[PDB]
Scaffold this motif. Structure first.
Motif, PDB file in Angstrom:
ATOM      1  N   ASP A 131     -53.732  50.768  12.475  1.00 13.98           N
ATOM      2  CA  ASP A 131     -53.303  48.968  12.457  1.00 13.98           C
ATOM      3  C   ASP A 131     -52.194  48.639  13.050  1.00 13.98           C
ATOM      4  N   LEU A 132     -51.063  49.680  13.267  1.00 14.03           N
ATOM      5  CA  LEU A 132     -50.488  49.493  14.655  1.00 14.03           C
ATOM      6  C   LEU A 132     -51.367  49.413  15.783  1.00 14.03           C
ATOM      7  N   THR A 133     -52.652  50.376  16.303  1.00 12.73           N
ATOM      8  CA  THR A 133     -52.522  50.162  17.115  1.00 12.73           C
ATOM      9  C   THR A 133     -53.462  49.220  17.639  1.00 12.73           C
ATOM     10  N   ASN A 134     -54.428  48.246  16.670  1.00 18.43           N
ATOM     11  CA  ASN A 134     -54.678  46.857  16.456  1.00 18.43           C
ATOM     12  C   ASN A 134     -54.025  45.971  16.814  1.00 18.43           C
ATOM     13  N   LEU A 135     -52.891  45.798  16.367  1.00 19.64           N
ATOM     14  CA  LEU A 135     -52.084  44.833  15.903  1.00 19.64           C
ATOM     15  C   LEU A 135     -51.531  45.013  17.716  1.00 19.64           C
ATOM     16  N   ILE A 136     -51.186  45.747  18.529  1.00 16.06           N
ATOM     17  CA  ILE A 136     -50.704  45.920  19.405  1.00 16.06           C
ATOM     18  C   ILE A 136     -51.728  45.611  20.687  1.00 16.06           C
ATOM     19  N   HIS A 137     -52.578  46.221  20.405  1.00 15.65           N
ATOM     20  CA  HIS A 137     -53.960  45.554  21.888  1.00 15.65           C
ATOM     21  C   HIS A 137     -54.709  44.208  21.697  1.00 15.65           C
ATOM     22  N   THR A 138     -54.373  43.520  20.232  1.00 16.06           N
ATOM     23  CA  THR A 138     -54.897  41.722  19.896  1.00 16.06           C
ATOM     24  C   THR A 138     -53.447  41.114  19.972  1.00 16.06           C
ATOM     25  N   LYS A 139     -52.813  41.792  19.204  1.00 16.14           N
ATOM     26  CA  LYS A 139     -51.408  40.847  19.017  1.00 16.14           C
ATOM     27  C   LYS A 139     -50.262  40.511  20.264  1.00 16.14           C
ATOM     28  N   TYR A 140     -49.666  41.884  20.624  1.00 12.55           N
ATOM     29  CA  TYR A 140     -49.050  41.685  21.684  1.00 12.55           C
ATOM     30  C   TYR A 140     -49.265  42.967  23.328  1.00 12.55           C
ATOM     31  N   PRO A 141     -50.794  42.352  23.632  1.00 15.12           N
ATOM     32  CA  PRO A 141     -50.502  43.267  24.896  1.00 15.12           C
ATOM     33  C   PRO A 141     -49.332  43.511  25.945  1.00 15.12           C
ATOM     34  N   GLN A 142     -48.057  42.744  26.356  1.00 17.56           N
ATOM     35  CA  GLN A 142     -47.880  42.669  27.140  1.00 17.56           C
ATOM     36  C   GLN A 142     -47.141  44.038  26.541  1.00 17.56           C
ATOM     37  N   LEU A 143     -47.652  45.124  25.723  1.00 19.27           N
ATOM     38  CA  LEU A 143     -46.164  45.630  25.578  1.00 19.27           C
ATOM     39  C   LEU A 143     -47.361  47.104  25.753  1.00 19.27           C
ATOM     40  N   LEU A 144     -48.534  46.695  26.298  1.00 17.75           N
ATOM     41  CA  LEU A 144     -49.340  47.594  26.119  1.00 17.75           C
ATOM     42  C   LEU A 144     -48.618  49.073  27.132  1.00 17.75           C
ATOM     43  N   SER A 145     -48.409  48.285  28.599  1.00 15.87           N
ATOM     44  CA  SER A 145     -48.027  49.162  30.119  1.00 15.87           C
ATOM     45  C   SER A 145     -46.638  50.138  29.504  1.00 15.87           C
ATOM     46  N   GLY A 146     -46.377  49.971  28.751  1.00 10.94           N
ATOM     47  CA  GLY A 146     -45.188  50.420  28.578  1.00 10.94           C
ATOM     48  C   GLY A 146     -45.650  51.312  26.875  1.00 10.94           C
ATOM     49  N   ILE A 147     -46.614  52.479  27.177  1.00 10.21           N
ATOM     50  CA  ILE A 147     -47.160  52.949  25.728  1.00 10.21           C
ATOM     51  C   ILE A 147     -47.556  54.370  26.350  1.00 10.21           C
ATOM     52  N   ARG A 148     -46.921  55.260  26.321  1.00 12.05           N
ATOM     53  CA  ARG A 148     -47.827  56.373  27.007  1.00 12.05           C
ATOM     54  C   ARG A 148     -48.475  57.003  25.916  1.00 12.05           C
ATOM     55  N   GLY A 149     -48.525  57.196  24.742  1.00 10.32           N
ATOM     56  CA  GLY A 149     -50.232  57.791  23.772  1.00 10.32           C
ATOM     57  C   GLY A 149     -49.666  56.934  22.371  1.00 10.32           C
ATOM     58  N   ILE A 150     -50.596  57.508  21.683  1.00  8.01           N
ATOM     59  CA  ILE A 150     -51.065  57.023  20.521  1.00  8.01           C
ATOM     60  C   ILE A 150     -51.798  58.698  19.863  1.00  8.01           C
ATOM     61  N   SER A 151     -51.284  58.658  18.486  1.00 11.23           N
ATOM     62  CA  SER A 151     -51.308  59.834  18.152  1.00 11.23           C
ATOM     63  C   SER A 151     -52.481  59.055  16.434  1.00 11.23           C
TER      64      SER A 151
END
Ligand code: NAD
Ligand code: NAD
Ligand code: NAD
Ligand code: NAD
Ligand code: NOS
Ligand code: NOS
Ligand code: NOS
Ligand code: NOS
Ligand code: NA
Ligand code: NA
Ligand code: NA
Ligand code: NA
Lengths: 429, 429, 429, 429
Positions: A131-151
């Motif tokens: 849910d948090l993964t998808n929310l960032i990819h689709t609603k807030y992509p501008q924040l993707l370059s500053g995230i090191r990883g997902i678990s």
């Protein structure tokens, strides 16, 4: 603006008592504290959590913080939060946005309050269900370059991760924590073995003994559910799409048929497929009087709950997350937690001991991504087997298990490091 | 004086929801109503009831009433009452005196309220554990000759009826309902199989899997508790004084040893003996940290709670019926329900289905005593095997069992009536 | 020169009767006959078999031949051959060199008689345990260039294959049949679940109920053995070097300790490790009187049988493959099949139904290697999952399992082919 | 006339090997010998034995003898004798008349040889199934008044003793050894749990896992057979006439239905009823191909073998005690042991450990009848609970059980002697 948002901060003291007891049950997480509290491998990490806000999760949260991270948290299910747990975390000074019985809008709201820290946007994601993964990819992509990883914790979430990756749309490196062996063969299997019946019992207090129980899906979750049900004297019927899973279940002494057949026989129905459209109107209409129907898979898509709301003559709330429907045909259906996760929805989720395996895997993944990003290019990754073995190791002490150590001669015979890993990559345990 | 005393009459609408559901799980009691609601065999009966005030008992009470009896009710344990069940029964205009968390003073008061009906004293006893029986023999002997009959629910109370007879104390005919086959070998066995774990789980949410669970006693309750904990992956150690029960446990793959030994090994402790002095100071000082200790036999004399209160450095209350004692050794003991019945004290007791067996036996006993005084001199009697079988038969249909019917040639061959009894009086099942 | 060599060709008729019955139990192998008897995908193949010569193996052999292959066969264990089975194959006109109770020299002899056909050297290898594989690599390398492939049945054999490959010394492409899921999670697990106890019982007729049984290793074989033992009322103790396996066993309710400890408690000892030096002199000397000791792993290296022969005061043969030793200390040890495979050694191996999964995997592997060599460069290969799923599929009919078919909508939701494979490569079932 | 009649006296040395092993599994019988070998309570007794001539019975016979009795022996089934056990007993100079595969004519002859001792007629009966008892009442009534006592092993024989008493036929005091707790609830239960599968497996090597097994009857034998087949992964269907037993099976998670239904579903059929006409023509014409059919109740009237002999197109013998009938429908039925006891007929009966319970009861019965005539009028009696407990106690040490000892305060509290009996006469265990 807010430091947190919980149902009642007054539940802090009781929560803390519950946290104290659970710590003593979760040696994986505690060893993590011994090892890494001084070195703080997570200093600089800004971890946004979306994962059931229970006592166990509290212990994980405080483990992340002791390891130097900043953490903001929300639940990944509207019914799963344990308010006393959320209270303790909030009173401890950790930003948590979680409470039992959220609306779909309060849900997205909570998640969004995890995105921004004192020093900037989030840079790590600990997700259960995507849910948090998808929310960032689709609603807030501008924040993707500053995230090191997902678990990612659960089987549905990782499924999604794979689909993202093979569609070219995943932009952050992801560890698959679900498919650590010390997760999938423990949490999914023995967790559900204890929390499914908990959830049914708290909701309905029905006798399992003498019932016919229909479990849809015989993967890790379905295996645990089936065995829990059979253990209490229910006659268990399994449905499956995978011939391999079906043969397993037949070899264990279960009847394996279709829902189209089993709907006429079952008194209790449990969905564990992680797939849409498992129990439908045509099934509900053929069920025995007072059938209990509940879902344990990650999303509430498996049971056609809309069909009930639209087609029942009568709908009576027995109590929170317990609904009794009267149909055209004069029979009743009991539905649990409006078709959402019943163990977490109607009880307290898995017990803390097994959750320690899950959460230890999570901590290692966070360290792995935070501290060793180069190891992890965009894509979906497993924890190395040596770490997997470490989490299990960490839990042996508490059960007084004595592990055999290979002799030098033995290790050479098996052509294996004396210290492991002891299994090849393809081993299925 | 009160027409009833409950925690909250406001809980009555939920309680009735729970009752509607329960009735549907209790075909035995329902069969009884569809059979005798017209003829009213208990016309003139004035039944004083001392028995756990749960949803299941509500259904029992209403059965009695519909059969023409008048009834006044108290609970037989201070923590076992379900407030909404109590309220639903009080709302229906039935005098009940029962709430969760009575004091010892309030407990005795409640039993007292059941003695006197508008038309004079009680003429029937329905008892679980023998407190009502003892109270009228000890304190109100002038009422004795006005009482037609006692029916007794449980092993402890029935044992006490035997002691009273053999001491020339017992002045009323009694029926031993516990030792109905359809009671002892169902409610004692399968009941505890479901309601023991429910009590532990609600109280502590501990993981059973991987623990060493020590079960004192291996009678009917012990067998059920052991199977339950085994089923979830505990390693179960039994203690016994009876070599027969001891050999049985051994043949089922359980280690059998003494408390003296086992207290050093167990994570969870369940007493089932009906006997005094099972777990003592010397056991407690040797237990693993956070050992969970609880009792499932009828009175609270099995665990030396006194020792914990006098010897602990500090007792922390966790929530109602859950205490964590700090000991001078630095280790912690979690005691449940102050050493009283854990299933009823910390959960909801047995589910309704199995209670339907016990309660149908209860109804038949009341009918037999009240309708046929001449058949039952002062002493302790069993229900006939014919009725014992009837109880069973009455639960078959709900489970979709098809019982076979002896042909005439087979009956002739076996030398039994086609319709039973099917077993000699000594048969053990 | 010889067409075959068996213990007694007179056992042909009985063998054939046994083959008839087994066919009807082995639908995987039979479907293979329906599909491929006309097209003969194995015409040209010259398959040398080294695999336990039992009834089941007979059905596989005759399946290979019906598929157009030439086959010559030997057993891969000196005790495992079923003479009536070997007789049937020989009488059918198939060259077989196999009999129960071979010498170590008759063993190598038999294997060598499989190497040469009417038309030339062998060109396919079907091996169980690596013996035929190793014999060619080290004794007859000149024959390596004319062999298209190897398929390997058991976990020890494939282990060896991997070690060969990573040492640069493997020269023929090899399919790992053991690690087909429809093999390792069926044959190894449920096979042993039924054949271990068979073997103990035929050898000794001991009561399992009430025993302490020590199972060394908790992999697929150890899982099945443990569960079989527990099912009969033995208290089961596990030893393990792998923390993951050990936690599994602890979570299932088994005590997990060292052999150094368990040697003092066990009445029955079963080795399943596939590793050297599991039960030694120091252990034998601490065992209870009349301990039973047997091995179920592929080679007889796990038990120090030499130590017994050298150190026992007295050695008495009770009957074929049953030896009773008297030690210095005055206690006795019963040793089964001189430490070789006890299920095959003292009984009839796995039953035919599960063996059908194993043998179906074998047939597919032989077709795969023979017909699609380009697919298989030097190295060790898995069967594709689609074929794995096919073997399971083929066995569902016979158990009357009805498999659910995914709807189009469902398959799209799960992002999966409607026809499978239904699982990712890393799935552990 | 013969001093004995066996298949082969040459098997005596193996037989003695088997005996040495067995004694060590039978501490109860051994305790008896170390206790009474000096005082010789059975001095003057002339015991005629009709009971399965197995290794276990050998040990029983030798116990009797060492206690001063003289003994003459026959088997109580035509297929159950173990030739080496028979030989070892004949070699020791004990008159025995028994071999595997007697005709009906030979069977009666053997029982006859047991009647007359050098010093005149038998004065004691030890019987299993009541054939010896019936034979002397029916055919040799003049010997009746010379016989002091009968002890009877099994449910069927004991049922017959009850019929004879209530018909005024029974002219000798009898003890009901079957209904000793340490017999019925051990040998009937756990015995069959181990020896049923052994019989099926030896006869057919069929896989239990994945099969539907239908068990007719759910008394003590049925409970054990059901558990055994469940344990290996069969799906077990029960049939019953008794609603109590039926409800028990249901509460354990077994479907309960009729043979009429179940014959269309089962792969394996075990009769346990003790009753005539269980599986008939109409069942057979509807069974799956290669259904395996066998009987484990005392006489062979449960399966209509007559129907198979008259109706099959063709009966193929497979090996001793295994027949495959071809039916007019083209399907095959595998019948075991011509419908006689499958465990004893196709395997080795119960293992020695459990037989030690039954046989210790047997010895005490003989002692009680012979030593204390005055205590036992003509009728059918149980052993006292004190002795019943002794039997149990005597097997504890071998299993390393530590029984607890009531303190004086506990005994006082429970109102029982420290040393038992620990249970009222009606207790069911
Ligand atoms: N705490 C919890 O409640 C909890 C625990 C872990 C996982 N989960 C969730 O449970 C679900 C299953 O998890 P798992 O690890 O067992 O996964 P899994 O991949 O092992 O799947 C379960 C099985 O469902 C079967 N299936 C799929 N579609 C089906 C259909 N239409 N009918 C019948 N069977 C069907 C598949 O063949 C598969 O074997 C996921 O949604 C997972 O995220 C919940
Ligand atoms: N719902 C419930 O909580 C529930 C249900 C039924 C009965 N009970 C109560 O549970 C208790 C046990 O009931 P039961 O029906 O199983 O009785 P039971 O007589 O069948 O079992 C009690 C067993 O405890 C053993 N025992 C006695 N003293 C012992 C000691 N010092 N150490 C070890 N073992 C000892 C006895 O040998 C006996 O076998 C009774 O008090 C009964 O009233 C509770
Ligand atoms: N029909 C048969 O008898 C049969 C069936 C299949 C496999 N096998 C053989 O059984 C063996 C095991 O097969 P598997 O599939 O279970 O393999 P596996 O890899 O699952 O191994 C069993 C376990 O042994 C453990 N182990 C290794 N050394 C140990 C030691 N010193 N002490 C304790 N535990 C130790 C490992 O941790 C492993 O988990 C192999 O030799 C295999 O070829 C025999
Ligand atoms: N080693 C052995 O083979 C062994 C051991 C003990 C006894 N037995 C024999 O096994 C038989 C059963 O013994 P038990 O001790 O379990 O007796 P039991 O009375 O406990 O069980 C028999 C059960 O069969 C049921 N039954 C009767 N007729 C039936 C029918 N037509 N259909 C279905 N169910 C029916 C009865 O209700 C009863 O519950 C007896 O003949 C006994 O002598 C054999
Ligand atoms: O008590 C709990 N606390 C937190 N997470 C839990 C608990 N029980 C189960 N899950 C987790 O929920 C996921 C599905 O969303 C599961 O994969 C499991 O790890
Ligand atoms: O849910 C319940 N309602 C009422 N009585 C119960 C329930 N569960 C168990 N018992 C009863 O409590 C007695 C011991 O005091 C037992 O004999 C049992 O029948
Ligand atoms: O009855 C049998 N026939 C042939 N092979 C067998 C039988 N039972 C077990 N195995 C095989 O023996 C291997 C170890 O050498 C196992 O991997 C199993 O597949
Ligand atoms: O191994 C054995 N030896 C001797 N008798 C046995 C054995 N196994 C079972 N029975 C006995 O056979 C009777 C049914 O006829 C049972 O009562 C049982 O005690
Ligand atoms: Na929890
Ligand atoms: Na309840
Ligand atoms: Na076989
Ligand atoms: Na035997």
């Amino acid at each position: 603006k807010l430091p947190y948002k919980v149902a009642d901060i007054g539940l802090a003291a009781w929560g803390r008592k519950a946290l104290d007891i659970a710590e003593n049950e979760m040696p994986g997480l505690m060893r993590m504290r011994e090892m890494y509290s001084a070195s703080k491998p997570l200093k600089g990490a800004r971890i946004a959590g979306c994962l059931h806000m229970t006592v166990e999760t509290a212990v994980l949260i405080e483990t992340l913080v002791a390891l130097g991270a900043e953490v903001r948290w929300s639940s990944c299910n509207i019914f799963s939060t344990q308010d006393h747990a959320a209270a303790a975390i909030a009173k401890a000074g950790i930003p948590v946005f979680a409470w039992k019985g959220e609306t779909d809008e309060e849900y997205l709201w909570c998640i969004e309050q995890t995105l921004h820290f004192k020093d900037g946007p989030l840079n790590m994601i600990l997700d259960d269900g995507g849910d948090l993964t998808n929310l960032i990819h689709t609603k807030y992509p501008q924040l993707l370059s500053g995230i090191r990883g997902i678990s990612e914790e659960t089987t549905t979430g990782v499924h999604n991760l794979y689909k993202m990756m093979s569609n070219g749309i995943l932009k952050v490196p992801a560890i698959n924590v679900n498919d650590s062996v010390t997760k999938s063969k423990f949490d999914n299997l023995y967790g559900c073995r204890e929390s499914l019946i908990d959830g049914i019992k708290r909701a309905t207090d029905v006798m399992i003994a003498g019932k016919v129980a229909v479990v849809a899906g015989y993967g890790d979750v379905g295996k645990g559910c089936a065995q829990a049900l059979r253990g209490f004297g229910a006659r268990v019927i399994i449905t499956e799409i995978d011939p391999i899973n079906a043969l397993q279940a037949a070899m264990e002494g279960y009847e394996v048929t279709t829902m189209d057949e089993a709907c006429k026989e079952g008194n209790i129905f449990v969905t564990t497929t992680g797939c849409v459209d498992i129990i439908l109107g045509r099934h509900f209409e053929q069920m025995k009087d007072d059938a209990i129907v509940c879902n344990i898979g990650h999303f509430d898509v498996e049971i056609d709950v809309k069909w009930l709301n639209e087609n029942a003559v009568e709908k009576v709330n027995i109590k929170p997350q317990v609904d009794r429907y009267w149909l055209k045909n004069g029979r009743r259906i009991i539905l649990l937690a409006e078709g959402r996760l019943v163990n977490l929805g109607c009880a307290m989720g898995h017990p803390s001991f097994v959750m320690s395996n899950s959460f230890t895997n999570q901590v290692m993944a966070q360290i792995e991504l935070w501290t060793h990003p180069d190891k992890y290019p965009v894509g979906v990754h497993f924890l190395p087997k040596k770490l997997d073995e470490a989490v299990a190791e960490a839990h042996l002490g508490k059960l007084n298990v004595k592990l055999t150590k290979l002799t030098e001669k033995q290790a050479q015979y098996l052509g294996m490091p004396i210290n492991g890993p002891f299994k090849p990559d393809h081993y299925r345990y």
